[PDB]
C-alpha cells in the first residue's frame, strides 16, 4: 500500500488479533455472551436460539444451541423449501419470513412430541423490520418466543398502539399486493421489470393472500422436511471440486525456485 | 399374584363382557392393553380412559387409574368391599387426542367494539374464524390465525346479544335487541337477506342445528328465545319462521337445540320446558322445580342451572321428573358444559367456584378454588383431562380434571374475562376492561 504507511516488526509482533468470527464481522460475541450463558443451576439445560438470518435472498431459520465444540442444529428450515408449499415468488419478503418461521415452529414442535429466543444477529432493530416477521411465524406457530409487539408493522409510535388490521396484511403479503396493484395502472415499464415472474405464472395481485394463506396450511399439514434428492455423491462433489483447488508444495519446490532464481536475477543477466 | 378383574361397561358405546385374568405385577398401561384387546379396538393412540369403584367419600383418596393393580388389589380405598379384594372394577368410555409441544409468547390482541360486550363463537377444528357480537351493535368476523379483521357485519339496528356460528362457518346468525336475528355468510359479510321477524322483544338466546342429519324435508334449523317469552324455530336457508313455541311467561334466557327433535328452553318463570318443534308447536313437558329463574341449560339428560343457585338434573325424555338436585354454590351458575360427555357437569358460579360433577351419581368431583371472583365461562379444554374457566380477576386457568388441582393461569392488570372459546390448539377470550383487546393465545 502507501510507502509512509506499511507495518513495522513490532506493529504486527504485539498484534492482538480479534477473535474469527469478528474478524469476519460474523459474531456480536457480547450478544453472543448472553444468548448463551445459562443459569449456573440449571446446570446442562441447553439454552436455545431461534436464529434467523437474511441472506441475499433465502432466509434461514434454525434452532440452535451450543457446546463447547460448537454450537449444534435441532431443526433448520429455509425459505427455499416454500416452493414445497406453495410459495414461489418474494421469498425473502416479510410475508415468506412468517411462513418461513411457521415452518421452522411446526417442524420441530414436531419432532418434539418449547422456549427459545430470537438471534437477530447483526440485523439492526427497525420496527417493522422482517426477522420480526420470522418471530410471528414461529410465535403463531406454536413456539414460546418471549417478544414485544413493538417492531411489528402497524406499531404507532406516537401511542403505546399496534394496528393488528395492518400486521395481518403483512403476514399475508398485502403491501406487496398493493404495490402491485397500484403499479398496475400507473406504470406498467415496471410492473413488468419487478413483478415480472407474477405475469409469467399468471398470478394478479388479489390472489396474493391465498397463496400464503394455503402455504399456511400446508405446512401444518406436513412440515416433515424433504431433503433434496442429491445426484452424484459426497465422493464426486469432492473430485470435481479439486480440480480447482491449488496445492501447496514441498520445501523443496520452493528452494529450487530460489537457487533457479539466483541463476536468472544475479548472475549478470 | 393375579388379579381378576371385572369391567362392564359405563355409558351407552362399546359393550363386552368376560372378566378376564392378567398377573398382579402389571400396569395401568398393560391392564388397558389387555381391556382393549377384548373390547376389540387396537392399541393404537385410543388412550382408553377408567374410572372405578363410586364412592370416595372417606378421609382419604379413593381409586385412581395409574396406580398398579397389586396394589390396588389390596388396597382399593379400604380394603376393599366384600365382593371387591378379587376383582378390580374399570368403567371404560373415550375420547381423547394429545396436542404436544406448549410454546409460549403473548396473545396477539384485536382491538374491537370500543367499550362494549356479549357474544363469542369459535369455529373449532379447521375454523380460524372468530365472531364477536357487541352491544355496539355489530358483530366481527376475526381470523384466529391473523388476529385481523376480516369484516365486520353492520345490518342490526340495535345490541347483538347472541349469535351462532355454523361449522362450516359460512354462515352466522345473530340476535338483536331489534327484535330481529339475522343470517349473514361470513365470508361475504353480507345478510343472508335473512332478517327474521316475529319477535316482539329482544332476541336473548339461541342454539343453532347447523346441519339437519334427517333427511333434506328437514333442513338445518336455529332456535331463539327472547324476552316477549316466545320461542321461534326458523329455516336458515329460507329465512322463515317455521314453528312458534308460546307457553312461557317470562323471559326465555336459555335454549339449547340441535337436539333435533328435541326444543328445550329455560325461562325467568323458574320453569324448564321440553318441546316437540315439528308441526305441532306444543310443549310436552315442564320441569318444575327452580325457585328461581333459570339462566342455563345443558341438552344431553337436561340440565338447568338457577338463580336460586340449583342444578337440576333431569331425566329420561317421558315423565319430566328430576333426578337430583345438585347444591353447593352460593350464586348463581352463569354457564355450565354438559354433554355425553360421560354424563359429567362443570358449572361456573358467581360464588367464584367451579364444579365437576357426576350427573349419574350426583356427586361432586371436584370443586376448582383459587379464583377470586365470579366464574364467567367455562371449557372443558383439553378434553375430560382439561378444564378451562375464565372470571373478572381476568384470569383464564387451566385446571387438571382428575385432580382439580390448578396447573396455570393466563391473564393480569386488565379487566375481565367475559366468556372464552377454546379449541385444541388455541384459546380465544373476550375481555373487558378500560383498555379492550379480544386475547388469542396460541399452543
Same mark, same amino acid.
Given at each position: 500500500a502507501f510507502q509512509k504507511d506499511a507495518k513495522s516488526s513490532a506493529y504486527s509482533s504485539r498484534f492482538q488479533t480479534p477473535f474469527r468470527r469478528r474478524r469476519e464481522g460474523k459474531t456480536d460475541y457480547y450478544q453472543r455472551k448472553r444468548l448463551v450463558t445459562q443459569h449456573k443451576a440449571k446446570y446442562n439445560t441447553p439454552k436455545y436460539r431461534l436464529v434467523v438470518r437474511f441472506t441475499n435472498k433465502d432466509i434461514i431459520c434454525q434452532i440452535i444451541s451450543s457446546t463447547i465444540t460448537g454450537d449444534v442444529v435441532l431443526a433448520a428450515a429455509y425459505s427455499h423449501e416454500l416452493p414445497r408449499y406453495g410459495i414461489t415468488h418474494g421469498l425473502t419478503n416479510w410475508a415468506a419470513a412468517y411462513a418461513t418461521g411457521l415452518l421452522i415452529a411446526r417442524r420441530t414442535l414436531q419432532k418434539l412430541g418449547f422456549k427459545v429466543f430470537l438471534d437477530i444477529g447483526l440485523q439492526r432493530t427497525t420496527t417493522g423490520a422482517r426477522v420480526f416477521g420470522a418471530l410471528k411465524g414461529a410465535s403463531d406457530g406454536g413456539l414460546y418466543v418471549p417478544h414485544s409487539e413493538n417492531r411489528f408493522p402497524g406499531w404507532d409510535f406516537e401511542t403505546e398502539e399496534i394496528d393488528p388490521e395492518l400486521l395481518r396484511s403483512y403476514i399475508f403479503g398485502g403491501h406487496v399486493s398493493q404495490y402491485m396493484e397500484e403499479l398496475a395502472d400507473d406504470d406498467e415499464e415496471r410492473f413488468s421489470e419487478l413483478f415480472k415472474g407474477y405475469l409469467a405464472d399468471d398470478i394478479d395481485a388479489d390472489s396474493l393472500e391465498d397463496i400464503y394463506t394455503s402455504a399456511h396450511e400446508a405446512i401444518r399439514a406436513d412440515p416433515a422436511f424433504k431433503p433434496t434428492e442429491k445426484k452424484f455423491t459426497k465422493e464426486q462433489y469432492a473430485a470435481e471440486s479439486k480440480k480447482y483447488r491449488q496445492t501447496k508444495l514441498s520445501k523443496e519446490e520452493r528452494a529450487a525456485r530460489v537457487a533457479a532464481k539466483i541463476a536468472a536475477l544475479a548472475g549478470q543477466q | 399374584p393375579n388379579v381378576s378383574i371385572k369391567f362392564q361397561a359405563l355409558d351407552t358405546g362399546d359393550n363386552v363382557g368376560g372378566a378376564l385374568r392378567v398377573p398382579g405385577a402389571i400396569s395401568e398401561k398393560q391392564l388397558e392393553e389387555l381391556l382393549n384387546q377384548l373390547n376389540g379396538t387396537s392399541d393404537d393412540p385410543v388412550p382408553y380412559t377408567f374410572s372405578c369403584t363410586i364412592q370416595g367419600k372417606k378421609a382419604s383418596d379413593p381409586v385412581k387409574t395409574i396406580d398398579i393393580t397389586d396394589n390396588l388389589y389390596s388396597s382399593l380405598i379400604k380394603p376393599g368391599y366384600n365382593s371387591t379384594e378379587d376383582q378390580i372394577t374399570l368403567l371404560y368410555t373415550p375420547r381423547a387426542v394429545f396436542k404436544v409441544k406448549p410454546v409460549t409468547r403473548s396473545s396477539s390482541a384485536i382491538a374491537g367494539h370500543g367499550?362494549? /360486550?356479549? +357474544?363469542?363463537?369459535?369455529?373449532?377444528?379447521?375454523?380460524?374464524?372468530?365472531?364477536?357480537?357487541?352491544?355496539?351493535?355489530?358483530?366481527? /368476523?376475526?381470523?384466529?390465525?391473523?388476529?385481523?379483521?376480516?369484516?365486520?357485519?353492520?345490518?342490526?339496528?340495535?345490541?347483538?346479544? +347472541?349469535?351462532?356460528?355454523?361449522?362450516?362457518?359460512?354462515?352466522?346468525?345473530?340476535?338483536?335487541?331489534?327484535?330481529?336475528?339475522?343470517?349473514?355468510?361470513?365470508? $361475504?359479510?353480507?345478510?343472508?337477506?335473512?332478517? @327474521?321477524?316475529?319477535?316482539?322483544?329482544?332476541?336473548?338466546?339461541?342454539?343453532?342445528?347447523?346441519?339437519?342429519?334427517?333427511?333434506?324435508?328437514?333442513?338445518?334449523?336455529?332456535?331463539?328465545? #327472547?324476552?316477549?317469552?316466545?320461542?321461534?324455530?326458523?329455516?336458515?336457508?329460507?329465512?322463515? +319462521?317455521?314453528?312458534?313455541?308460546?307457553?312461557?311467561?317470562?323471559?326465555?334466557?336459555?335454549?339449547?337445540? &340441535?337436539?333435533?327433535?328435541? @326444543?328445550? #328452553?329455560?325461562?325467568?318463570?323458574?320453569?324448564?320446558?321440553?318441546?316437540?318443534?315439528?308441526?305441532?308447536?306444543? +310443549?310436552?313437558?315442564?320441569?318444575?322445580?327452580?325457585?328461581?329463574?333459570?339462566?342455563?341449560?345443558?341438552?344431553?339428560?337436561?340440565?338447568?342451572?338457577?338463580?336460586?343457585?340449583?342444578?337440576?338434573?333431569?331425566?329420561? @325424555?317421558?315423565?319430566?321428573?328430576?333426578?337430583?338436585?345438585?347444591?353447593?354454590?352460593?350464586?348463581?351458575?352463569?354457564?355450565?358444559?354438559?354433554?355425553?360427555?360421560?354424563?359429567?357437569?362443570?358449572?361456573?358460579?358467581?360464588?367464584?367456584?367451579?364444579?365437576?360433577?357426576? &350427573?349419574?351419581?350426583?356427586?361432586?368431583?371436584?370443586?376448582?378454588?383459587?379464583?377470586?371472583?365470579?366464574?364467567?365461562?367455562?371449557?372443558? $379444554?383439553?378434553?375430560?383431562?382439561?378444564?378451562?374457566?375464565?372470571?373478572?380477576?381476568?384470569?383464564?386457568?387451566?385446571?387438571?380434571?382428575?385432580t382439580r388441582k390448578l396447573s396455570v393461569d393466563l391473564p393480569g392488570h386488565k379487566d375481565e374475562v367475559y366468556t372464552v372459546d377454546w379449541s385444541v390448539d388455541g384459546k380465544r377470550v373476550c375481555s373487558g376492561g378500560k383498555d379492550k383487546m379480544v386475547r388469542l393465545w396460541t399452543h
Open positions: - | 367499550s362494549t /360486550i356479549l +357474544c363469542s363463537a369459535f369455529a373449532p377444528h379447521t375454523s380460524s374464524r372468530m365472531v364477536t357480537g357487541a352491544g355496539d351493535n355489530t358483530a366481527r /368476523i376475526w381470523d384466529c390465525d391473523t388476529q385481523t379483521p376480516m369484516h365486520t357485519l353492520k345490518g342490526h339496528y340495535n345490541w347483538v346479544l +347472541c349469535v351462532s356460528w355454523s361449522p362450516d362457518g359460512e354462515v352466522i346468525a345473530t340476535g338483536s335487541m331489534d327484535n330481529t336475528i339475522r343470517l349473514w355468510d361470513p365470508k $361475504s359479510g353480507q345478510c343472508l337477506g335473512d332478517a @327474521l321477524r316475529g319477535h316482539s322483544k329482544w332476541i336473548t338466546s339461541l342454539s343453532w342445528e347447523p346441519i339437519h342429519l334427517v333427511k333434506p324435508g328437514s333442513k338445518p334449523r336455529l332456535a331463539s328465545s #327472547s324476552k316477549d317469552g316466545t320461542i321461534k324455530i326458523w329455516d336458515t336457508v329460507s329465512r322463515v +319462521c317455521q314453528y312458534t313455541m308460546s307457553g312461557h311467561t317470562n323471559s326465555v334466557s336459555c335454549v339449547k337445540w &340441535g337436539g333435533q327433535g328435541l @326444543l328445550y #328452553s329455560g325461562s325467568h318463570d323458574r320453569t324448564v320446558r321440553v318441546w316437540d318443534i315439528n308441526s305441532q308447536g306444543r +310443549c310436552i313437558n315442564i320441569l318444575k322445580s327452580h325457585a328461581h329463574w333459570v339462566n342455563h341449560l345443558s341438552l344431553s339428560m337436561m340440565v338447568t342451572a338457577s338463580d336460586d343457585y340449583t342444578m337440576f338434573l333431569w331425566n329420561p @325424555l317421558k315423565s319430566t321428573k328430576p333426578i337430583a338436585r345438585m347444591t353447593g354454590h352460593q350464586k348463581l351458575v352463569n354457564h355450565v358444559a354438559f354433554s355425553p360427555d360421560g354424563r359429567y357437569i362443570v358449572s361456573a358460579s358467581f360464588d367464584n367456584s367451579i364444579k365437576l360433577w357426576d &350427573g349419574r351419581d350426583g356427586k361432586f368431583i371436584s370443586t376448582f378454588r383459587g379464583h377470586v371472583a365470579s366464574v364467567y365461562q367455562v371449557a372443558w $379444554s383439553s378434553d375430560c383431562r382439561l378444564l378451562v374457566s375464565c372470571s373478572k380477576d381476568t384470569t383464564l386457568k387451566v385446571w387438571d380434571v382428575r
